A paper describes a structure:
Eukaryotic DNA replication begins with the loading of the MCM replicative DNA helicase as a head-to-head double hexamer at origins of DNA replication. Here we characterize human double hexamer (hDH) loading using biochemical reconstitution and cryo-electron microscopy with purified proteins. Although both yeast and humans use the ORC, CDC6 and CDT1 to load an MCM double hexamer around double stranded DNA, our work shows that there are clear differences in how the two organisms accomplish this feat.
Compared with the full hOCCM complex, the ORC and MCM are bridged by WH domains of MCM6 and MCM7 domains but not that of MCM3, which becomes too flexible to be seen in the absence of CDC6. Despite the weaker signal, the OCCM-like benzonase footprint observed when CDC6 is omitted support the latter scenario, as do the OCCM-like 2D class averages obtained by negative-stain electron microscopy.
Residue numbers in the entry:
A (entry chain 4): 191 to 355, 369 to 397, 414 to 423, 439 to 535, 544 to 669, 680 to 721, 729 to 771
B (entry chain 6): 20 to 38, 42 to 101, 110 to 172, 194 to 252, 294 to 305, 327 to 604, 613 to 665, 713 to 736, ...
C (entry chain 8): 456 to 544
């Protein structure tokens, strides 16, 4: 029995709260589980009484702030928010969702303090069923209608109203302020209609051993990198380097905290720019990335302030860029966008943060996103020129901020047209479904670190690269790419292969 | 409440027995004065006198406060309000919960809005209109002649920037001040308020009683003293403040100087002279500029960061907004006035519109901001130092065009910056190697690649101690400054009296750095170079064992000055003089032999390559080429 | 002085035990000298090792919690600390 150890831990800590898994109740007693589902409001007091009696029998000298309360969680009823029916009123329900807004601290009376107006006789009245049992006679002088209520002396309970993505959630006392907007929570509570949900518990590994073994077996294949490149976007032909770059961006770099150095948190997420004629694989690839990647965002060429109709207070709304934090945001027609927005992009591209100073509102926001942008040359045709600006007309700052820039040119080769037409007229499954979980596992588990041989290789690479013209930011991007390629092999150390591959890809992109 | 009577008796005990002189007797006697009606009591004295009473007052302050006032009145009448101070625990606004109602806690915040003084009736004498019965001493649950009134003030406060979590709106709290606490707080100030959180019909309101704005430990004081005697303190501070940035030490010296700052002076004509320094940085994208901003932001707690284009004119200085409840017009603070007596950092200053820079103009020089919009007339203090970062018109500094053509800044804006550095990126192999090795070492060896001579907290303590001194300018420094400015002004960025004031401020900052009560000409000589340099490279190339160009020029200047002075010598004699002069730096025999090697090589090189020194016939006579100035 | 501050914090919090993070954050936010959290942690460890009877530490799960006896006389503790400092000299 784990519950006796839980009671002992509670005795050690003194926190009167019990977390009970509903599956244990179902396995132990199906009838009791059904009773809990049907009438939680009546069985929870019985559970509290039982656990309190057991704890006091075991340790009667407990100086507890409050009686031990049972908080069940993870019920079988994981119904969707849109599947609610009038039948399950006053029944336990579990819903996963996103938190949008949380209200301020709302005090609610639970004990009413009444004092006699003559002899100052004091009494306490329990608040029950939304009605106040105000005493009408005194306990000392028996004077009728001599009771006065003191708000300060009364007992208040904190309650909070939360909007979940919609349903209204009511957190009470301890549960108040435990959830921050922008997080995904599994809320367990009783369904009640006036509709609203009263919160009882908040919930904020996923792979079996066979899945890990299969991942290791695939990784031991030296061809896994190219095989996954072939697996990405099967409908897209002869863009293997682009798929390689997309996969490296999906892996990304590793996060490092430089708090001890006094330096700001350096960007560790990869951004790629694409330029070419419209009607090419831009839109299809962007849609594929947006659909495949969870929390992805698709936009076409920011935060804003909203009035609260209740308190007349100016609240803030989060744009798609903020909503896609720790995700991937893709943009089409980068050239055709206003200069005002592209000026704002410099801050999010560089510092991963965003600062606003307007109408007295000063705030800073975290914007950990990867930008995959598609752009159209100003000539709508690859005019024979030298610099990419001569064809696309983009400032040096934005181009320098991009880690990888790729150009889509339709070659004037007959065989290429034959292959394109055959691919269209003729227009794997084992890979992408496994790959989503594989990428999640790689992100959660491993992180690479740099080595001395890679140090020397990168130093020589930089000193050779500047001879071609080169900025240190491309060196940072090369470090990030080496980390990504190390993540590809599931190797905890960055070796010569990663640096050589990153340098090869960068030089190939520059040559193209 | 029996415990309230016990608390009253114990408060009488504390008032009558605390000592070898009772501290509160004179204050109680002064309470007889009509203008004095609140008593200030230290919390540490209460807790040391007894613990049960201290805990009870800390836990039931609202319950026993009127009994405390009754005890105070009884004690005074034997020969009124009670105020408490020096509570050792500081709390955050986000920590305020319903569980803390009735607790004596003190809260720290910044005042944003104020309201006028209102009379509050406490006890009212009521006359019945039916039987003409006078009902006296009627308390109010939130005849004017015989009733009691107490002054009131309403204060709206806002969360501090440091305590503000990222992505969160700073919540506002209402503060009630009564009796002597009225008018003790001013808008725009940061204060700590001691009191309780009361429940208003519900609504959350904090009741406050008091406001807040040699004794240092022996070891900290001695560490500050010992480090103040370091001869290489300037270079050590320069290295320690930017351990992870390679080269460009001139910007480091400039930012350190503006951190020190000068002294402001107000003339008898009422005109105030700015004692601060404004710095502008323009450079090619390669050179690190935002890193300096981040470092100065994380180091200085009084630093504010903002972007260029995203900031409007109203958001920088202030804006006029109509208040919903009052149906009137108020002023909401801008970034500049929140950075009062601090430093404000602006990134991408070029992207800002001219309509914003013209608003900045007034705060730049006059150090104040004035608003005359929509019937609201006011002036506000903007005592700030501005650090601006920008890039040239084109991403690349084009040498085919003149210096003036390359910078798109207005002439007064160019003039009102004291130090103006321009960075140009060059392709040098040794600089590339150094930058690459530093970056990779930082990336691989995050913590072990940092060697700080002094702790950041130690630097902060020294800076706090040093800033309060106000050095005096000597007559020698006076005429040296006169002649230096004579020479300087005789040569786009025109040099006007503003640059002379900046030079005086720089001399004062150098004087404050060295903890010297008087200003010496050495500070003037040091600042003259930094004012002159303007365009500055990343790193000077080595000179053939290698030696720096600046050190080479320093040695040449010293030797030429000594020879020219002696004109109104011998090789060995001059070397002996140099070794005598440099004795304060050499600490080992190896350094002596290295210095001998260096001086022999430099003398030979000047004799046979630069021709500045002429040999006249083992110890040849050396003379200066008569065309070196 | 840090001991006095810790005593006052435990008086204010109305709690028998507190975590390292919250206690260190409050002490730093209330101390007269700016210090790093690591220095505060080492100071707390030194206090625990020198004076175990007053101050006790309990390792629970993945955290260590701080419990103190509030009834001890502060003057006697200050005298004991002064004696310990003199002995260490
Ligand atoms: N001397 C240096 N020491 C160490 N790193 C450097 C140095 N110079 C440049 N870097 C690197 O180059 C990066 C560029 O820094 P930034 O200050 O952002 O450049 P910038 O000149 O401000 O360009 P903008 O204005 O942001 S487009 C830094 O983050 C460092 O990684
Ligand atoms: Mg920058
Ligand atoms: Zn009665």
């Amino acid at each position: 029995p784990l519950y006796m150890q839980r009671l002992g831990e509670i005795n050690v800590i003194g926190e009167p709260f019990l977390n009970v898994n509903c599956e244990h109740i179902k396995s132990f007693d199906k009838n009791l589980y059904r009773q809990l589902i049907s009438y939680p409001q009546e069985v929870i007091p019985t559970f509290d009484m039982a656990v309190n009696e057991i704890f006091f029998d075991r340790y009667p000298d407990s100086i507890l702030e409050h009686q031990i309360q049972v908080r069940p969680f993870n019920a079988l009823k994981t119904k969707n928010m849109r599947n609610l029916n009038p039948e399950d009123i006053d029944q336990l329900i579990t819903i996963s969702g996103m938190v949008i807004r949380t209200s301020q601290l709302i005090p609610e009376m639970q004990e009413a303090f009444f004092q006699c107006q003559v002899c100052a006789h004091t009494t306490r009245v329990e608040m029950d069923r939304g009605r106040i049992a105000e005493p009408s006679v005194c306990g000392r002088c028996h004077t009728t209608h001599s009771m006065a209520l003191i708000h300060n002396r009364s007992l208040f309970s904190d309650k909070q109203m939360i909007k979940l993505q919609t349903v209204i959630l009511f957190a009470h006392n301890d549960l108040v302020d435990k959830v921050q907007p922008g997080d995904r929570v599994n809320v367990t509570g009783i369904y009640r209609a006036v509709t609203h949900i009263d919160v009882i518990h908040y919930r904020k590994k996923l792979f079996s051993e066979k899945r890990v073994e299969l991942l290791k077996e695939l990784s031991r294949k030296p061809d896994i990198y190219e095989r996954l490149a072939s697996a990405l976007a099967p409908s897209i032909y002869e863009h293997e380097d682009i798929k390689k770059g997309i996969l490296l961006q999906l892996f990304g770099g590793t996060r490092k905290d430089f708090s001890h150095t006094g330096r700001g948190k350096f960007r560790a997420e990869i951004n790629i720019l694409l330029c070419g004629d419209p009607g090419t694989s831009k839109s299809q690839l962007l849609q594929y990335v947006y659909n495949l990647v969870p929390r992805g965002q698709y936009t076409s060429g920011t935060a804003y302030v909203m009035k609260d109709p209740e308190t007349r207070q100016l609240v803030l709304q989060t744009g798609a860029l903020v909503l896609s934090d720790n995700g991937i945001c893709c943009i089409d027609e980068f050239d055709k966008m206003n200069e005002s927005t592209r000026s704002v992009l410099h801050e999010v591209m560089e510092q991963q943060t965003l600062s606003i100073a307007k109408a007295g509102i000063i705030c800073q926001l975290n914007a950990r996103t990867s930008v995959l942008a598609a752009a159209n040359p100003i000539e709508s045709q690859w005019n024979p020129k030298k610099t990419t600006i001569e064809n696309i007309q983009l400032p040096h700052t934005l181009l320098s901020r991009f880690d990888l820039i790729f150009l889509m040119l339709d070659p004037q080769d007959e065989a290429y047209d034959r292959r394109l037409a055959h691919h269209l007229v003729a227009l794997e499954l084992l890979d992408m479904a496994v790959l989503k979980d594989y990428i999640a596992y790689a992100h959660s588990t491993i992180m690479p670190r740099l080595s001395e041989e890679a140090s020397q290789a990168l130093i020589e690479a930089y000193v050779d690269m500047r001879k071609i013209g080169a900025y240190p930011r491309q060196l940072e991007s090369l470090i990030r790419l080496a980390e990504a390629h190390a993540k590809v092999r599931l190797s905890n150390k960055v070796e010569a292969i990663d640096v050589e591959e990153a340098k090869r890809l960068h030089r190939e992109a520059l040559k193209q | 409440d029996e415990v309230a009577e016990k608390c009253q008796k114990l408060f009488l005990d504390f008032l009558e027995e605390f000592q070898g002189e009772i501290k509160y007797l004179q204050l109680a006697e002064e309470l007889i004065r009509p203008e004095r009606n609140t008593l200030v009591v230290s919390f540490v004295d209460l807790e040391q006198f007894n613990q049960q009473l201290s805990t009870t007052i800390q836990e039931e302050f609202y319950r026993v406060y009127p009994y405390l006032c009754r005890a105070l009145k009884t004690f005074v009448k034997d020969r009124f309000y009670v105020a408490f101070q020096d509570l050792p625990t500081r709390h955050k606004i986000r920590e305020l919960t319903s569980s803390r109602i009735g607790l004596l806690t003190r809260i720290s915040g910044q005042v944003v809005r104020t309201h006028p003084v209102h009379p509050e009736l406490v006890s009212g004498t009521f006359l019945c209109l039916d039987c003409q019965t006078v009902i006296r001493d009627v308390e109010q649950q939130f005849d004017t002649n015989k009733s009691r009134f107490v002054d009131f003030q309403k204060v709206r406060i806002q969360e501090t920037q440091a305590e503000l979590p990222r992505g969160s709106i700073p919540r506002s709290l209402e503060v009630i001040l009564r009796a002597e606490a009225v008018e003790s707080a001013q808008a725009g100030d940061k204060c700590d308020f001691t009191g309780t959180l009361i429940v208003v019909p519900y609504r959350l309101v904090f009741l406050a009683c008091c406001v807040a704005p040699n004794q240092m430990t022996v070891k900290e004081w001695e560490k500050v003293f010992e480090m103040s005697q370091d001869k290489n303190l300037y270079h050590n501070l320069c290295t320690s403040l930017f351990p992870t940035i390679h080269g460009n030490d001139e910007v480091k010296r400039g930012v350190l100087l503006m951190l020190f700052g000068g002294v402001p002076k107000t003339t008898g004509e009422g005109t105030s002279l700015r004692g601060d320094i404004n710095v502008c940085i323009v450079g090619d994208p390669s050179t690190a500029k935002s890193q300096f901003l981040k470092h100065v932001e994380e180091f200085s707690p009084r630093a504010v960061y903002t972007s260029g284009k995203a900031s409007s004119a109203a958001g920088l200085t202030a804006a006029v907004v109509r208040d919903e409840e009052s149906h009137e017009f108020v002023i909401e603070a801008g970034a500049l006035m929140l950075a009062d007596n601090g430093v404000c950092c602006i990134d991408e200053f070029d992207k800002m519109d001219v309509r914003d820079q013209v608003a900045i103009h007034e705060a730049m020089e006059q150090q104040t901001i004035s608003i005359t919009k929509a019937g609201v007339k006011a002036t506000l203090n903007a005592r700030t130092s501005i650090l601006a970062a920008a890039n040239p018109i084109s991403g690349h500094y084009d040498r085919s065009k003149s210096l003036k053509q390359n910078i798109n800044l207005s002439a007064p804006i160019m003039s009102r910056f004291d130090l103006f550095f321009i960075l140009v990126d060059e392709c040098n192999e040794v600089t590339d190697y150094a930058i690459a090795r530093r970056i990779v070492d930082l990336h691989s060896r995050i913590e072990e690649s940092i060697d700080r001579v002094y702790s950041l907290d130690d630097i902060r303590r020294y800076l706090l101690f040093a800033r309060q001194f106000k050095p005096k300018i000597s007559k020698e420094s006076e005429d040296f400054i006169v002649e230096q400015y004579k020479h300087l002004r005789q040569r786009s960025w025109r040099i006007t009296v503003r640059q002379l004031e900046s030079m005086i401020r720089l001399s004062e900052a150098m004087a404050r750095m060295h903890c010297c009560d008087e200003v010496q000409p050495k500070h003037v000589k040091e600042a003259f170079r930094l004012l002159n340099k303007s365009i500055i490279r990343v790193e000077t190339p080595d000179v053939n064992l290698r030696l720096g160009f600046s050190e080479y020029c320093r040695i040449s200047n010293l030797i030429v000055l000594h020879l020219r002075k002696v004109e109104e010598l011998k090789r060995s004699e001059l070397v002996n003089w140099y070794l005598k002069e440099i004795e304060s730096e050499i600490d080992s025999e190896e350094e002596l032999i290295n210095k001998k090697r260096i001086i022999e090589k430099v003398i030979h090189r000047l004799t046979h390559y630069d021709h500045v020194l002429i040999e006249l016939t083992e110890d040849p006579y050396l003379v200066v080429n008569p065309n070196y100035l | 002085e840090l001991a006095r501050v810790l005593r006052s914090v435990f008086v204010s919090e109305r709690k028998p035990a507190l975590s390292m993070e919250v206690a260190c954050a409050r002490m730093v936010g209330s101390c007269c000298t700016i210090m790093s959290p690591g220095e505060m942690e080492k100071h707390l460890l030194l206090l625990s090792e020198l004076l175990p009877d007053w101050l006790s530490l309990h390792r629970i799960r993945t955290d260590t919690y701080v419990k103190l006896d509030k009834a001890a006389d502060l003057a006697h503790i200050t005298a004991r600390l002064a004696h310990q400092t003199r002995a260490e000299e």
